[PDB]
Amino acid sequence: QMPSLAPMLEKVMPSVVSINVEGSTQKFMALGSGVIIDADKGYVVTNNHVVDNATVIKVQLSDGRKFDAKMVGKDPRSDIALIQIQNPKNLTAIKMADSDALRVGDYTVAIGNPFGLGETVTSGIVSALGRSGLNAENYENFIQTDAAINRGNAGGALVNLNGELIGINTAILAPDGGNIGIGFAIPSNMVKNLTSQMVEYGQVKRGELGIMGTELNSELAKAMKVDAQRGAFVSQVLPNSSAAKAGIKAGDVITSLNGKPISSFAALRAQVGTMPVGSKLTLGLLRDGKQVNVNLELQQSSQNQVDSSSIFNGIEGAEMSNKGKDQGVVVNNVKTGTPAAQIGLKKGDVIIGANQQAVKNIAELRKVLDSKPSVLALNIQRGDSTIYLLMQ
Template sequence: MKKISIICSSILLTTTLAISSLPAQANLPLQLNGQQMPSLAPMLENVTPAVVLISVKGTHVEKQNIPDAFKFFFGNPRQNQARERPFRGLGSGVIIDADKGYIVTNNHVIREADEIQVTLKDGRQLDAKKIGADESSDIALIQVETKNLVEINVSDSDKLRVGDFAVAIGSPFGLGQTVTSGIVSALGRSGLNNENYEDFIQTDAAINSGNSGGALVNLRGELIGINTAIIGPNGGNVGIGFAIPSNMVKNLVSQILEFGEVRRGVLGVSGYSVNGEIAKAMELDANQGGFVERVEPDSAAEEAGIEAGDVITQVNGKHVKSFSELRGKIGSIGAGKDVELTVVKANGKSKTYTVTLKKTQSANIEPASIHSMLEGAKLNNQSKGLGVIVGDVEEGSPAEVIGLRKGDIIAGVNKARIKNIAELRDYLSEIKGISLLKIIRGNTIFYIRIR
């Protein structure tokens, strides 16, 4: 389970809260000095059956890093470099479709799980199957088969404001369902993992292990986010927690249901967040947004007319504060979908573009189709055209046999530098016989021979 865990808020609603600020259903006939006291109990009675406990079992393969010079002494290197360890884990989930039994949770809750069991609030225990997942956004969809489920209504998270009340529901430490309350502390947060697509809701929270995948709801009991991460020493609570916005969840789940995976759309720009120094240097009127440093050739952005030096300030009419937030919003929208971008041009004028997002270059190119010795490796393009990064490598695959490891960067073929997967494929298709892949691993550069 990830070290960054989950969100549960811990600000108590007191009798000083104006009763008019709560929905009518949140009032109980309890009285103090002749006045009704506010309570979340009626709302929670309707919502909590839609939040479940998830327990998983599986086997984690641990690799042993044996230097090449010593592998001869350990017999079969493949047998001695991997060790299987059983594991168990706990998390939470949210029922989003009662008829079909669909439950949303975090990918890190069910990752590598061989068995997934769901416990409902009424005590029923059900086996679940994985429908699909997206590691880069930490969203997964599982399914159970039963009747009389309760689903949660999903809210429009784009309408959230800082200061809105939020209620977190989950199962910390496997103790059973727990409810805490707080407020929306910030919107559009990112930067926890620069490799991922992030656009988090931040909330003050009583954070505990086991809440991952649980629900963050508003006072109407509508889902506004899936709890996913915290900041705190040793997983402890310091009042900073994060949830994946419900609109992002809806986009990702719809792709998983349609394709069995997330087919992420790509804008085709690189850049950085606008700050005071950049605004001054470029004489920009905008002090927030995503500064476009480079537009990729033949990309969706280039075809729409976006140029280097532009500042993207809005996505579908919603302001973006940083390039990371821009990346997170775009990353949850599927390939082939239209997105409306508001841009501040170099002359200071604002212009709106309609952009049709393209597929990632790695989405429709299988490593084995590039070269047979790359089979078993997950390949992705580095940002800014800096080569191809190797993701997970399947044990015993041709890619592992030639020496590729997770995190390696394929920077060139023979003497040619490559920028992306498409160039890697093109160079290898033209070369007959032996090729040398230039690999960057940490601070080391070396070559791997393939034929």
Template structure:
């Protein structure tokens, strides 16, 4: 030990002797000194955070419980439904200070009878709903107040993986909180969180109560609305999702004009392009939307789109998958004109389509199967939407619920009520309906 210490001491002394001596008047700069300003997000946040609000809601919703065994002999098998009060917290973003428009998530204010918006300065106001869309999880509120601050919108289509992000919201009711991160991925879909998914993924910490809050860039511009997280027990593990600002902007424009979303329809069905499909179809691309069918008389057919085409761009922006195409088109209104970049037999073409009104087919489910009696079904986008379920009906007794989406029959995909009827007419014995309920996939058996 002594010899090692001597060698180390000699080395240190040699370094001190050989190192150049700084002039007496020289100063070493450090963060916080007069010579160099401490880098900080504070100046930007001071401008933006007044535009992010806390939202508290109250109301009542219907809850279901299985009838006690003693009552089933009188009323038969079924469920007991009753109203139960609830309260909730979330976040919102002021996007128009003059008109008092506040954007949030649909799930934050869903079924709420009372909505209160609290500003950063402590003022609180009652809010009214202007429009809401469960399938995209966006809602627009309005408050009457002076001295509001709005956030400016960025072009979310211009985002790149690696861009810095800042999330602002009200996690766990603590009050306004700021976290930072980067764009981890773009165009995330297939998560089963919403009907239309084209999420920005970020590692900025997002927790319960952040829903409806702002995701901004370093300029303080809104790039997304914080919506969901992926993590155990609702905790943050660095995987959060936000609805892109451009998607939100398109929906808000329809809320303001119509009070609802009037989706435009392209009129195609398809699937995500992958290596296997590209190889079998001899397509020189690995990403995009593969067109399986073009609906006769649709906007797609009128534009010249054909089965076998691969859609690679929408309005000049790259499309990674058919799911992303669906989500983007679904937020555009009836009559919107879009440009589609496609690959057809290795040729790059650009087609122009004018979106048409989406035709909705409503059907009494008893015409499809006796055990579905009591349910009202409607064509959705690549699914059959359960619009209503009558209390104590056969449909209710097998477990079907309002808002469910029927996406398959015995693992065969269903896109509309016509396909559902065809598959059920061919089925024999026990048949499994594949259901999407919120972010869960489940099966309901019918005989």
């Protein structure tokens, strides 16, 4: 006869896990939380900042059980990392909710491991949607909540009253590292995209419209005679870009993506910034007081991702990324005094195998590395030649 979150949480708490990490860059230990995304494969999502530069990763269920997990993907720009429990048995995954249907009155409960106390649940409401600006280089479209979140909560669950995941708790505004009522989670639609890519590739293949923009504030709107105090202002479109081809002109205002009204430029960036190349989308446009509708196809890019370090753990040097279809890992750009080039690593190289195993993409590669061989025999192609690079 008493209302309670207990019935819901009982089904849901098994989904959320604690995460302990040992690493170096100087030895450190860290801890945070994670969410089980696929029970069968033992996929567990979490903040990239928690598991970044980790030598060892251990995951602990609510029931006590510990497992070891290995990395499978990580995206610093959005701060989402995907890991995988080695030898997953009898797990519970969380069902994801559609974060786009969230409203500010909405109740939320947060679950995670503050200060490593153990699985802690706290609750609140949605204080705000679309918050960004925390770190302006990243994609950020944060849900804001006043459910209590502290250090150790990172990577944990933000769920609604039905126990569906709506976000991953990531950061808090807080002088003096204590919670004051303001915390942020990555909306779950973003997690759904980013992770699904990582699963299949080991990284995110970032698509772009190829427009330069900025927040459409009220002042700018007068300058431009537009009826609209919010949106993405198109400063200019790149030549031979999706936008270009689609007919978007500079001095346009983007008001909606795929039906969904657009909070701001950042939100827009964040949305598309997480869709995979080749995605077909449609833009709500506003040029000279007239509404416009345009169909676009997300295209390639020059995304700065996956350094040689994120895959070798400590081997500074050239950045790397997949290549075409499952064609192997390509080395982007080697530095100079960077240890990687100090093993013969030269930009333009195409890692096509390792230790007699085929490498189609970064996931496969990281897989050979998971076995932790003593000597790593890279099978690369420079120009029209096969060569081998060795490590220890």
